[PDB]
Amino acid sequence: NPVERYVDEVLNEVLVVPNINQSHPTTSNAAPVLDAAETGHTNKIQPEDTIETRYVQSSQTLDEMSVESFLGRSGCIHESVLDIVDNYNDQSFTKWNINLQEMAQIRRKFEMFTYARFDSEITMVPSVAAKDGHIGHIVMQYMYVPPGAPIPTTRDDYAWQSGTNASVFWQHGQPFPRFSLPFLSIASAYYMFYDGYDGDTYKSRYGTVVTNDMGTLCSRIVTSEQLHKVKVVTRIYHKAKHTKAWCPRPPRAVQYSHTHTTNYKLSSEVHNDVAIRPRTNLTTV
């Protein structure tokens, strides 16, 4: 019943963990504790098998541990900066090659899976810093330029007309802009890792850069030159909706150094490079 299912959503009890049943002492030639890790399988022994447990009714749920929950939280993926210093025409617009590889926080979560398919919710948080005192009337334009569409080279470029491209206009004072984007890949899922090239020569590119092109985001201060200079920083937040993930993998142990690559750097003292805290010895807890 969708209504009973609805209540489960509200109470967050869609996925319940099993109970612990009462066990008793045993003397058998069947030893569940013994197994063989060589098989590649995990021994499914439970607490009732090693000790005498009591009956306990579990009331915990796994809803929050779902992939939708794990990846369904908005995190910053980019910080666009438009700092008017000495040339309005040149400093009033910018572009960014879209990707989820620049911020370690969210990148690491997505990278715990090999492939992922999801829709995106983008929320933008613009903040206008009054460098000279007043900010006037700030109106912004965020244009999504898919690969192929002409990228504007000036703040008054004809590409800004957005005859076909999607543009979001934000007027300072109004609530934060937000919009959704369907699964944009030409494949069935986004490659989180890609052991491939775009060719077979020594100079061929390697990794996700070959497969993950999401276009460019071109920003612009629509308002014309004002007496007082401002610094507009627009933070882009991304949330995954309707997510699916395949083939889980180990979490990134070292820091990220570049986008679209697993490359890393190690110091002379590697223990400083990983989260592992050195032990004094095996018996020191």
Partner: peptide, 29 residues
């Protein structure tokens, strides 16, 4: 777009926009 259930505890699962991507978080399997 409204999925109206009844039990009365009537449930309205409205979808304000015509694109599937527009909807919120998904239900659990």
């Amino acid at each position: 777009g409204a999925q109206v259930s009844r039990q009365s505890l009537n449930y309205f699962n409205i979808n304000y926009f015509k694109d599937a991507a527009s909807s919120g978080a998904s239900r659990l399997d």
